[model samples]
Target: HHWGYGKHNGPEHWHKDFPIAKGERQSPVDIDTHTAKYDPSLKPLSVSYDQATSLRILNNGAAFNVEFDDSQDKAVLKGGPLDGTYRLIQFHFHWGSLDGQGSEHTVDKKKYAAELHLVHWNTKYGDFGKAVQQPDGLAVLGIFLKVGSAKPGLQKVVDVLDSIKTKGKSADFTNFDPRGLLPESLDYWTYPGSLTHPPLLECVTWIVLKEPISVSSEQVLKFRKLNFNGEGEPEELMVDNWRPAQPLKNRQIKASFK
Candidate 1:
C-alpha cells in the first residue's frame, strides 16, 4: 500500500522499500531565468473541481492529467502578458532530499521545498510534440509548495492516493477543479526554454508562478517514500530521484511584476 524510509526511513537504504519509476520526460532542477520575453495578454479558462481528470501515481511521482471535456474543451488559456494561447495538457509535481527546495525553476536564485508544473500547449502553432520546437509553442504554470500547514489545495489530490498507491498506478480524477492547485498569488516569472528532460527541446515557454502552497512535513514524506524501482528490488525505496539544474544556454528570464 503505502511506504516509508529514513532512520525508520533511511535515505540510503530506501530503494528496497518501493519500486523504480517509468517516466520518459523526466527533468532535473531549473533555477535560473532565461529568455525573459513574454506576451502581456494571457489568462487560463477555469475548470471546476468536478471537471478535473483522474489522478495518476507512478514510482517517479504523481499528477492530474486534465481532460478537455466538452464543457471545458472550448475554454481559453491566457498567459497574462505572456504571448501564447496555451491549452491545458497535464499537471505534476517535483521534490527533493529535504523540504527546503526541489523545483527546477528558481526565483532570484531562490528555490522552494517543492514545485508544481501545469503543462499547456499552444493549439494555434500545433500539438505538444509539434509545439516543442517553436519559441511560443508551450506555456507551463509553475507553483511552489512550501513545508508548512496542510495545503487545502492538495486535499482532493491526497484523497485519491489510495486509488493508485502502487507504482505505475493511475486513476481518473473527476469533479476536481485544477484551478485549486494554483496559489493565491498570480505573480510569476517567465522565460524562453525547453523541456528539462532529455530531448531537452528548447521550444518551451515557461511561466513559473511565484506563490507556493503549504504541504505538511508528513505529507511531503508520502511523496518522499515513493521508490523508482518498478519490479527489481521489492525492498528498495525512492529517497532522492530529482535531476540537478541545467545550463540556461544564455537565455533571459522575465518577471511580470518586476
Candidate 2:
C-alpha cells in the first residue's frame, strides 16, 4: 500500500513497510511538562539564519517544505542540547483539516491548531542525507501554532502557498528568514526521537519550544487547500497531515525551563 496521511496508508499502517515505525524512540510524543525534569545546565539555543540562503518552497505531497542552502554554514543552530553546529536544511508544517486539531506533538494532552518543524543536520555528519543514518545526525526544532493575529513573517510564506499548491510544484522563495517564524521564547523540551515519516530514522534530537507562534484562522485554513496529487491526477486535499503522538517508552524529557 502507498504511504500517506490517508486512513489506508496513514501512521497506523506505516509499520507494515517500516518496522522502525514501532521502534522505541518514535517522534510526536505527547509532552507532559509536569513530569519533565528541569535541567538548569541546558544552555541557551543559538540560531542564525541568512535570508539569502533560502532557496525555495514546495508542496512535497505529504506537506509543504521550505528548503535552504545547506552548502555552507549560512544558517546554523548550536548550543542548547547540541555539542556542534547543526545546519538548517529545511522547515515544514503539519496541520489538520480544520482549526484546533492539527499539531503533531501535544502539550499536557492539549492539541494546537498546527505545528512547524525546522529540520537541521549535524555538520559532524557531513550532510543531511548522511546525518539521517547515524545516531547524532539530525535535530528538529518544533513550534506549535495557535490561531490568533496574523504573523507578518509567517505571511511571507503563506503568500507563496498559492504558487505551489500541487504536489511536486515549487517556486523560488528567497530573502526570507526562517528564524522570524519562531516564538520569542526559546525555552524548550528536549528528547531523542525518530522522524515522523517513513524510513522513520532514529537520528533526531527533538527540541520542541514551549511557546507557540500565532497564525490567523484564515492562514491556517489556506494550508488545507494544498493538493496532495499532481497535475491531471485526482485532487487530494492535504489536511490533517500529522502523525498521532507516539508512546514515550523509556525516555526522559529534559526541560530547559522550570
Candidate 3:
C-alpha cells in the first residue's frame, strides 16, 4: 500500500515534525516572514471565464501542469481578491501514497484527506521561478478534497491518469481547462506563504478556496495503484511519497468572496 504518514502517524511526523520542519525551507506550510503589504494594490493580471483558450500540458515529473493556451473560460480578476493576474499555468494534485491521507497544504496543523493545487503565474511578470521572487507575483488556488460516498467531479482528470501513471509523462488535454472543476464559489482565503516543496522560496500569495471538492474512496485507491517506478525496479510500487507539512510561523490568513 502507498505509505503516507505524518509526524504522529502522519507524513509530517514521519521524520520528526518540529525543528526539522522549521529547519527545512520548502513551499507551503511555512507562514513566517510575511507582511500585510502584499494586498490587492499590486495584484497581477486577471482572467475571465472566456472559454476560448486551448488547454495543453507541460509535464516534467514533479507534477503535470495543465495549461490554458487559449483565452476562453478565463478571467482578469482584480482588487483585494488577489496579488496579481495569475494566468492558468497548470492544475495538478498531491496525494498520499496510501488511501487515508495525502495532500500538500494544511491548516492549523490539520492535514485534510487530500489536496489539489491549481497553479497560476503572474502573466504580467515572468516565469514561475521569476514570479515567485516578487511579493505579489504568484497566486495558487488551493482546494481541499474530502472522500465520501460521492464521486469527485474529477473523473475527467482521473480517467486519464492511467495513461501517465509514470513520472515524466505528458499528454495533450485540449478543451480541458481546470475551471470546470472549481466549486461554484470564488470566495477564498488568502495568505502569504511558500511553495509546498523544496527550493522553499517564500513570498507566494496563496488563494485557498474555502469550498472543497468531493471524491469517492474508490478513485482515491486508484491513485495508490500508480507506480512511481520508471525503468529498473523489478517490483515497483507507488507507496507513501509526499512531503510532510511545515510550520506556520507568524502568517496571517484572510478570506474573500465568502
Candidate 4:
C-alpha cells in the first residue's frame, strides 16, 4: 500500500501498515524549551563536509533528497550527544502547502515554515541501511526554516527543484557544502526518537537546533511546486509531507547549551 500526506493515507493511517506509528519513541515531538534540561557536559556539535562528495538530487515520490557520498568519512558529524563520528548520507526537507504550519517539530509549541533534516549514520554500523535497524545507529540534525532574509546557500537547492519536479527524477548536484544551511549557533535539544517515516525505526538520536535559518517567502513557496505524482499520471503537489508531533511519553529533552 502507498503512503502519503493525504486525507485517506496520512499520518493517522501510517499505523495500519507500520505498527511503529504507536511506538513510544516516535519523532517530531513538540519541544517545550522551558521543560528542557540544560546539560553542560553535552559537547558542541562538529560538522565537516566536503563539497566534492555531493552526488545528485532526487525526488523519491516522498521528498527531495540531496544525496552524498558516504563511502568514506568525507562528510562527517561528531560530538554533541553522539557516541562516535557519523557519516552524512543525505539531506531532505518537509514543508507545507501554505505558510504558518509546516515544520514537523515545534518549538515551545510554535511551528515554522519548514524543516530540514540532515541524516547521518554512525560509522560503527558500516552503512545507513544497517544503522537504521540498530538502537543507536542514526542521528538526524533538525533545522527549522523561518521566513525572513534570504539564504544564499539554499537558493542553489531551490534553483534545481524545477528539474526534478516529478517522482523518480534526479539531477546532477555537486560541489555543494551543507554547512552553509546551518544556523550560527550549534546549540540544540537532544532526545531519543524514531524516524518520522515508515518502518518508523527508533534508532535516531534527535538533535533539534535551537536557532532557525532564514528564507524568503518566495523560496518557501517554491517547495510547494514539487509534485508527488510522475508524468502521465494525475498530478499532486508535494506539500505537508510531515508527520504530526507524536506523544513525548516518558522521555525528557536535554539542551546542549545553558
CA lDDT, every model vs. true structure = 0.57, 0.92, 0.57, 0.92
Per-residue lDDT over 1-258 for candidate 1, one digit per residue giving the tens place of the 0 to 100 score: 333323453323323442221122223335444445444544542323343443333333332233444324343467464554566766667677787657666655676777777777777765667777676777677788889899776777766655544456566665656766767777776666656543455556676776778888877777665554454546444444434454554555566654
Which lDDT value does model 3 have at 224? 65
Worst 10 residues of 2 by lDDT: 46-55
TM-score per model over all chains = 0.72, 0.98, 0.73, 0.98
Residue range with the least summed lDDT across 10 consecutive positions in model 3: 30-39
Give the higher-TM-score candidate: 1 or 4: 4
Q: List the candidate 3 regions with Cα displacement exceeding 4 Å.
A: 1-27, 30-49, 52-54, 57-59, 70-80, 149-152, 232-241
Those runs of model 1 whose alpha carbons end farther than 4 Å from true positions after fitting are 1-76
Kindly list the per-residue Cα lDDT of model 2 for residues 1-258, writing each as its tens digit. 689999899989999999999999999899998989999999999988753388899988999999899998988999999989999989999999878799999999999999999999999878788999988899899999999999888888888999998999999988888868989999999999989998899999999999999999989878988998997899899999999999999999999998
RMSD of each: 7.4, 1.0, 6.0, 0.9
Question: lDDT: which is higher, 1 or 4?
Answer: 4
lDDT of 2: 0.92
lDDT of 3 by residue, 190-255 (tens): 777766654345646777765677778887777665555554544344544456655545556554
Residue-level lDDT of model 4, residues 21-124, one tens digit each, is 99989998999989999999999998887532889999998899999999989888899989998999999999987778899999988999899999999999
Higher-TM-score candidate among 2 and 3? Answer: 2
